[PDB]
Design a binder for this molecule. Sequence first.
Ligand SMILES: C[C@@H]1C[C@H](C)C[C@H](C)[C@@H](O)CC(=O)O[C@H]([C@@H]2CCC[C@H]2C(=O)O)C/C=C/C=C(\C#N)[C@H](O)[C@@H](C)C1
Ligand SMILES: C[C@@H]1C[C@H](C)C[C@H](C)[C@@H](O)CC(=O)O[C@H]([C@@H]2CCC[C@H]2C(=O)O)C/C=C/C=C(\C#N)[C@H](O)[C@@H](C)C1
Ligand SMILES: [Zn+2]
Ligand SMILES: [Zn+2]
Lengths: 402, 402
Amino acid sequence: DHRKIGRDQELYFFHELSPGSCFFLPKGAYIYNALIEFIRSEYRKRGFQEVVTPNIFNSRLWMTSGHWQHYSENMFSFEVEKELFALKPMNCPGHCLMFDHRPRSWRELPLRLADFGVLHRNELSGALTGLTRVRRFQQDDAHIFCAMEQIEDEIKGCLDFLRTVYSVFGFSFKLNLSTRPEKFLGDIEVWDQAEKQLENSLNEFGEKWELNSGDGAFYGPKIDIQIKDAIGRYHQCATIQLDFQLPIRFNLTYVSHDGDDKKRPVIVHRAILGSVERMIAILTENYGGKWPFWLSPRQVMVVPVGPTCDEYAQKVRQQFHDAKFMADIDLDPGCTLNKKIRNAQLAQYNFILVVGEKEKISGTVNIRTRDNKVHGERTISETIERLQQLKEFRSKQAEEEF
Amino acid sequence: DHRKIGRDQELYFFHELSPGSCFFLPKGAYIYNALIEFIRSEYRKRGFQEVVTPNIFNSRLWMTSGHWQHYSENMFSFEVEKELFALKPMNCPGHCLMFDHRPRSWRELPLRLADFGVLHRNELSGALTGLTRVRRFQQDDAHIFCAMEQIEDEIKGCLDFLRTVYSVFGFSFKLNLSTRPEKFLGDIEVWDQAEKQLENSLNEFGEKWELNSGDGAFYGPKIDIQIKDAIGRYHQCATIQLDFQLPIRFNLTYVSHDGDDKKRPVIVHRAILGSVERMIAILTENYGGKWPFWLSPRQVMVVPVGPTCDEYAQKVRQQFHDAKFMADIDLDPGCTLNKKIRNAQLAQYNFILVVGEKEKISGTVNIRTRDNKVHGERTISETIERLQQLKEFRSKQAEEEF
Ligand SMILES: C[C@@H]1C[C@H](C)C[C@H](C)[C@@H](O)CC(=O)O[C@H]([C@@H]2CCC[C@H]2C(=O)O)C/C=C/C=C(\C#N)[C@H](O)[C@@H](C)C1
Ligand SMILES: C[C@@H]1C[C@H](C)C[C@H](C)[C@@H](O)CC(=O)O[C@H]([C@@H]2CCC[C@H]2C(=O)O)C/C=C/C=C(\C#N)[C@H](O)[C@@H](C)C1
Ligand SMILES: [Zn+2]
Ligand SMILES: [Zn+2]
């Protein structure tokens, strides 16, 4: 489904020379960068600070993190000057080094570090499918370093995030709490404070949530989120994961209000999209090829009524292109208006701007949609402004709200 | 000094667990993304199309491109499922695969594909210095696929690209043509057409250039370009490099206007900044920590006169942060106005917004620069507007031009 649309819409493809990795053609790449810019746009508002980290590390780091022990087979390892190195499966330890880079206080907390960095995980070749099961991807990854007392407040924020992002997509979602398992690490009082705060947040949030007892990780309790597509399928995407182990293994510390300087923070792993790749696949199948305007690789199709208008159509497009819209043009003299409009619709262009003598004289465009409805003849400036609003607010039906 | 400035400004650091790879703190990360965004802003105007490509490839690909026989000592390679894979030192072969993905025509040319993808090259620990000699970097990398006859024009565009970017940085620059070496591959006629067109555009560019004979690569002629910093030191960053070998090795063809489907295009490797890392090192060295407002990780410092205004100050600081600016705040009740201002000026904040009771009721701010010049009182909206104009135009002196 999403793969066939990927090839048909010239979004992305796969080659046997890099299994589990994807090739994004300029349009799919536009979608990639669009999603990332969305996440960042929310980061700037929510107090998340993006960082750039290394993609490879010495084996010792993975030894202290616990990957070399429990993840070793999923990691690509190689040798640099007789020392063991590996590509990062996760961004977490690198962020731990960043927190531990200098002394930190309680006034810095909560400290939220976001990373889009490239993750590699070694998946058996037989199990690889499309963008769903991959060896390479960029996850929208942030870690929250806070005090225990702050947890409840950070979680509710973390939920407010989800509900916002998904509400842009038009997804409905369900939540579930996985608590302390049989075998667990660290003191149980910490576990209890944490889980109490988690429950309080989930209840304050208002959504019906499920409790899976003992299904949490040994290093911390967790909230999992599943997304429901248009057809009603569920995909595990978002997660909120507490880690008490990581601060101990990297010996992480802040200076309390008190301030005792031996207090360790709590780590919160969170992702919302999952990975960009995964979100792209799911969205490609969910939208059925019809992309919302802000995500759309083909936003505008300028078509002339006749060759006489070929120049005007060139101007118009350029102007829309200078408005940061993805705007193409159909100049083929050997094809009819209706056929160009229809083909633009089959190619899933959100807006088709038809121009003719009347439009050339008045400096206007005749607005057609993908649906294909008529929005009449408007000035190019009016149209640009309206489209700009539809793009900025990420309207899911732009054509109807025009 | 760029290391010392990186640490003192809290930009980036290095760790023994990943030598040759850099850790970018939120400020350095801002600089990073700002540079990439600049290059993209110029890509959108010049007809460059960005793509996303895999970071690891099968040994077969590198044996096709020639990296296996040539660059293998600088490549990190590892075994997966009894097959050799490697991290990509360069983006080129993947782009060749993207060109070869479907049949193409003269109408599609020139086809300019840009890639910001992460590149690793294996450098000796002893050779590693800061951001200047690294194992990990993101190149601003583009490949132009054009017909031979188009070369002279494309090169011209390339130069115009070079001229624009550097002029934003305020960099003067040198140009040198390297031509066919004694040991060379490809037909000599092709070489002669290429070098002819290169000479022509270098001459129509109107800037003095040096001729280095036989100093070119075996696979093509090239134009190397060096930038001079404010101190008068030259750095090798930009390159335009022709490749006839890559199209042959990957068997790339397009359909000519005349109907011939057997014609190979010419590949043009181009990079303006070299690597983002490298450009960051050079700019850190060049500016002395005094960043142009658009590149500056510290844009705005909000200082309240007294506790009564601590509220208003945080609203201001918030609004500016929503406006996408980097805006900090100095709340310390134990410190005087003048030393908060002086310290902000020492920390190289471009603009210092002082906020009193008078400003709280008026919905205004009192503007002071890094150079300790007063712009007086302006509304928040006005200030945001002017600052945004100065940011969008990437002005070299924002403080003086406000
Ligand atoms: C090295 C250990 C392997 C662990 C047993 C892997 C499990 C399969 C599972 O626990 C992983 C997990 O849920 O990670 C989830 C991540 C978060 C988002 C998506 C999920 C993701 O990235 O897949 C987060 C956990 C990171 C955890 C650590 C780190 N560093 C732990 O301290 C460390 C003990 C993990
Ligand atoms: C495998 C070959 C290795 C070649 C001999 C390396 C030389 C040391 C040097 O010529 C590399 C070079 O100039 O690359 C320069 C790149 C371009 C900008 C920065 C520079 C950069 O990235 O450093 C570009 C060349 C890419 C070339 C190819 C590819 N693929 C060639 O077809 C292929 C034969 C390269
Ligand atoms: Zn994590
Ligand atoms: Zn190249």
